[PDB]
């Protein structure tokens, strides 16, 4: 689709292998903001949102948490507290015709900027002055959308680039998209280091007689540390304690 109506796809309940994405050299831009691209196969996410569109090669910078700009203000806004990745690749053969590709369209002439992740499908005549422009376009009345030409001989900046941005839900609510890893059986009553679907730590695990309500996934402490967890694959609650330390 185009930046006028960037397509959003929710994906969940996967086993996502981000290494195949990060290893293929096809992409020109592959930049991750809240995470590290090499460390995506170890974390777990609740959901992940893939936003797809096509733009010019100039404003690939505009897809950024801040970075105010024409498209970044009027078409697609990234929240400042962004956690995710941005993928962009030139796709001139797929989207530039000898006669030119003119069906790709993007927004100008909006009354204001956009909220982060806000969609703008409104195609209404713009008002430059104060005319009550009902379907007219005379010297103050602009139709908000303008297109691209996308000639194969264009410069790099005007060529088509297909862009997809992944936004992760690192919310600790029960995860569904988890990277490729091999769950092992759990050992209790021993100071071991554990990885409960992205929740890393080190301590001694034990059965607990505290009853989670069926919707919690882990229990936390006065300090921002976990003291009880819910085991996947068993839906069982485990107490976590630090394995003993002291002075000498």
């Amino acid at each position: 689709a185009s930046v006028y109506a960037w397509n959003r796809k929710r994906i969940s309940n996967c086993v996502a292998d981000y290494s195949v994405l990060y290893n293929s050299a096809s992409f020109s831009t592959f930049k991750c903001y809240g995470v590290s691209p090499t460390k995506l196969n170890d974390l777990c996410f609740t959901n992940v949102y893939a936003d797809s569109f096509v733009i010019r090669g100039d404003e690939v910078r505009q897809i950024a948490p801040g970075q105010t700009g024409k498209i970044a203000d009027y078409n697609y806004k990234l929240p400042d507290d962004f956690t995710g990745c941005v993928i962009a690749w030139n796709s001139n053969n797929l989207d530039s015709k000898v006669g030119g590709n003119y069906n790709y369209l993007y927004r100008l002439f909006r009354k204001s900027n956009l909220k982060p992740f806000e969609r703008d499908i409104s195609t209404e005549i713009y008002q430059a002055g104060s005319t009550p422009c009902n379907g007219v376009e005379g010297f103050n009345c602009y139709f908000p959308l303008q297109s691209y030409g996308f000639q194969p001989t264009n410069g790099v900046g005007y060529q088509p680039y297909r862009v997809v941005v992944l936004s992760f839900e690192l919310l600790h609510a029960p995860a569904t998209v988890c990277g490729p890893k091999k769950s092992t059986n759990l050992v209790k009553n021993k100071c071991v280091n554990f990885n409960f679907n992205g929740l890393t730590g080190t301590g001694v695990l034990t059965e607990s007689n505290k009853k989670f309500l069926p919707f919690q996934q882990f229990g936390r402490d006065i300090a921002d540390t976990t003291d009880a967890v819910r085991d996947p694959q068993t839906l069982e609650i485990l107490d976590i304690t630090p394995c003993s330390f002291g002075g000498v």
Epitope: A1, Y4, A5, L105
Partner: antibody, heavy 123, light 114 residues
Framework: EVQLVESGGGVVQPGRSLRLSCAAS????????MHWVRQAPGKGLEWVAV????????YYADSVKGRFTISRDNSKNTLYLQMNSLRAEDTAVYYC????????????????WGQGTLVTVSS | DIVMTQSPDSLAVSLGERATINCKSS????????????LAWYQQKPGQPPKLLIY???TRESGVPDRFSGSGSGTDFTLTISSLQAEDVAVYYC?????????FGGGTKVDIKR
């Protein structure tokens, strides 16, 4: 106002590999994507493949995997389809077709059909 | 991919009347950046390669009288023929072009019922 004359064709034995070449006339060949559309006796239309206007991207059909390859000799205005290891179900008239670059992407609906051959599969 | 269900398949309806062929694919083969429904209606007389009737599943192309009419959206589409003539004992098809691999319809062998 396009005429397509397809070389190749005739009876073929299964397990053999050969090729068709379709010469195009009446337009600018190197700026139009090509399609192969099977017209099976009593079945109808079955899409096969597509080659980009410059021939940059190649798409093949699902049940055609492991069988065909399709190239495009723009010099003599020809589309080449090298078919391999044919089966007795693959007898049909395989019409070569010229696209119209009208859709937003580099593929769209088709307008012009050329009269393909009758590669005949039988042992 | 996008598997298409085209109904009905064996139209046997007398001359002059209306008729309608609906199409229902698994995917909603449409686009909103360009409110154009990537889908086409074709027809074929026996002995010839088929002929293009409707593009964008709604819009009429030249050389097409009102004996053909395309419409539809979402994933449901309709080819409506207002009046029948003697040259329209032919097989009708639907065809997607939203996303590869492309698919066709099952066919619709229309005849003037006698």
């Amino acid at each position: 106002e396009v005429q397509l004359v397809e070389s190749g064709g005739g009876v073929v034995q299964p397990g053999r590999s050969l090729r068709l070449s379709c010469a195009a006339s009446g337009f600018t060949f190197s700026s139009y994507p090509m399609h192969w559309v099977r017209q099976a006796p009593g079945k109808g239309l079955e899409w096969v493949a597509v080659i980009s206007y410059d021939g940059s991207n190649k798409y093949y059909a699902d049940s055609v995997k492991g069988r065909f390859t399709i190239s495009r000799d723009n010099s003599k205005n020809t589309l080449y389809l090298q078919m391999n290891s044919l089966r007795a179900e693959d007898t049909a008239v395989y019409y070569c077709a010229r696209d119209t670059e009208d859709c937003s992407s580099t593929t769209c609906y088709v307008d012009y059909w050329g009269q393909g051959t009758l590669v005949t599969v039988s042992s | 991919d996008i598997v298409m269900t085209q109904s009905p398949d064996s139209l046997a309806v007398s001359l002059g009347e209306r008729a309608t062929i609906n199409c229902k694919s698994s995917q909603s083969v449409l686009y909103r950046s360009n409110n154009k429904n990537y889908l086409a209606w074709y027809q074929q007389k026996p002995g010839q390669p088929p002929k293009l009737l409707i593009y964008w599943a709604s819009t009429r192309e030249s050389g097409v009288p009102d004996r053909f009419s395309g419409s539809g959206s979402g994933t449901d589409f309709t080819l409506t023929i207002s009046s029948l003539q003697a040259e329209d004992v032919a097989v009708y098809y639907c065809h997607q072009y939203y996303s590869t691999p492309f698919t066709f319809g099952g066919g619709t062998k229309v005849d003037i019922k006698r």
